[PDB]
Design a protein around this ligand. Structure first.
Ligand SMILES: Nc1nc(Nc2ccc(S(N)(=O)=O)cc2)nn1C(=S)Nc1c(F)cccc1F
Ligand SMILES: Nc1nc(Nc2ccc(S(N)(=O)=O)cc2)nn1C(=S)Nc1c(F)cccc1F
Ligand SMILES: [Cl-]
Ligand SMILES: [Cl-]
Lengths: 288, 288
């Protein structure tokens, strides 16, 4: 594959130092490059077969093809002895949700504004490049040593670039072509499907304000129904938060998809008019 | 591949009798099975490499996976000596546009109603199965010996089944999931993109009424702009046609995609309340 190395042992290049996490696709390791000492998160995924490699390729391609300050970069990928190894630039601060559980408190508003401003830069880049993240949450937002964030986990992301390029491809005179296809207003080019990330952004903000996401107290079987039935969630103790926080949430957490703001529109919102990460440097300093 | 035979010579099974057509992907042959005498259209596509096979796989999969009276079936596919052979059930009457050029006249209204009624059955089936044809025109509607039609050419079709199945796939509790994703109102499940076939249906009807499609007289470079700028096309000599023909066209040829009818809705329209192919049997009898 374009970005996956064959026939070489990943541990002749990368040394495992310890375990970072552990989830549904196995354990994630802290790796260190044996030549350069560069640190990595190493995902090691058991594959029963080779056809399974196709299930992980969109993620690899997104990581390898993205070049943004607030998206994690691909350092290496190996297929060796029935495992896919994915090495990702290391974010020394860990995930936002892991910090809140360690400090046993939510983020402050000024801290949320920084994460939000940078997270939004990442999403805007993704959407501009026809990528939908599809699993935005506090656990997939990582803190760097310098108090910045990077967005991670493209395991269920969609990349519409090849399908856009394929569908625009025609030959001969297209007398029969629908005007929305003529006008490049097919679903691949309209905001509609990308706006699902905007809603998840809103939920992540409440998750950062309150440690846990809305409906965390329900039987998990009820959560999808609850989202369907309910008005959009709001902050539980609204006096604690600014009008700008509350107003930003309402542009995100809007069930009418046409009325929900794009990442482009949200970048002009005063809640993200910040340019210093000092509140996050203070937070990650207390966690270190 | 799931539906493509390797290592066997297609001409040890199928005998070429002659040429049917000739287009951008080469010549199409009239083939005859050497054991059974069953007739086929044989597409023979030059491939420079094996990676190119992926470009033709969605089409093969659609043909192999569809089971409808008014869609052409896959009889065989072979990869041999750098060519992909695709064998498709033979429609002895040829394409609708080829008949109009042979007889040098358009279809009558009663003939259009039959083609339309059957073409619509095919599309409804496709859309129900998450397939967009994407190249509906009179040249891709074939007449059978019995006066029925079959829809062909899935060379640029979209099949959203695997991508729908992939995107519904989640694990753990989805607190962050947008309500339109909860409610299965993503673009894969909404009518929006499938309605592009409905518009092409409308143009094909005018093409059958008038031999050539709207704007056939323009410089080909102008046609896309003309579709963009213009109100939807209408029949050139409207006194020749029934109110039901004209009204059916307006439900199809509607620029507001939300207001354009689905194939489901169009099946209830009186223009397609027909159940005899006798007008088409009369037409194909004159062409034989
Ligand atoms: N790029 C990256 N850096 C890190 N650093 C990290 C992770 C956990 C911890 S820990 N165990 O919380 O102290 C510390 C640093 N994790 N990480 C990734 S990609 N983690 C991660 C993730 F965020 C989501 C899914 C799978 C993963 F492996
Ligand atoms: N299934 C099928 N049957 C036929 N029959 C046919 C075609 C041409 C003629 S001819 N040359 O007009 O008399 C007669 C019968 N053609 N055909 C197909 S799939 N034709 C065709 C097509 F309709 C669109 C694209 C490529 C194709 F090869
Ligand atoms: Cl982790
Ligand atoms: Cl042909």
């Amino acid at each position: 594959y374009e970005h996956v190395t064959r026939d070489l042992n990943p541990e002749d290049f990368w040394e495992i130092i310890g375990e970072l996490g552990d989830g549904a696709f196995g354990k994630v390791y802290k790796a260190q490059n044996k030549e350069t000492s560069v640190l990595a998160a190493a995902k090691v995924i058991d594959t029963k077969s080779e056809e399974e490699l196709e299930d992980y390729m969109v993620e690899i391609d997104i990581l390898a093809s993205c070049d943004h300050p607030n998206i994690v970069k691909l350092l290496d990928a190996f297929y060796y002895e029935n495992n896919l190894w994915i090495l990702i630039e290391f974010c020394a601060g860990g995930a936002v949700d892991a910090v809140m559980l360690e400090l046993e408190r939510p983020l402050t508003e000024s801290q949320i504004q920084v994460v939000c401003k940078q997270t939004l830069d990442a999403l805007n880049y993704l959407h501009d490049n026809k990528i939908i993240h599809r699993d935005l949450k506090a656990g997939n937002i990582l803190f760097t040593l310098d108090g910045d964030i990077k967005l991670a986990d493209f395991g269920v992301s969609a990349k519409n670039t090849r399908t856009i390029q394929r569908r625009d491809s025609f030959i001969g005179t297209p007398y029969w072509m629908a005007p929305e296809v003529v006008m490049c207003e097919t679903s691949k080019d309209r905001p509609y499907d990308y706006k699902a990330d905007v809603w998840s952004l809103g939920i992540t903000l409440i998750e950062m304000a309150e440690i846990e996401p809305p409906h965390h107290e329900l039987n998990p079987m009820r959560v999808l129904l609850k989202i369907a039935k309910s008005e959009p969630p709001t902050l539980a103790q609204p006096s604690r938060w600014s009008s700008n926080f509350k107003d930003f949430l309402k542009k995100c957490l809007e069930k009418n998809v046409d009325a929900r703001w794009t990442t482009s529109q949200l970048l002009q919102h005063p809640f993200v008019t910040v340019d210093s990460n000092k509140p996050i440097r203070e937070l990650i300093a207390e966690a270190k």
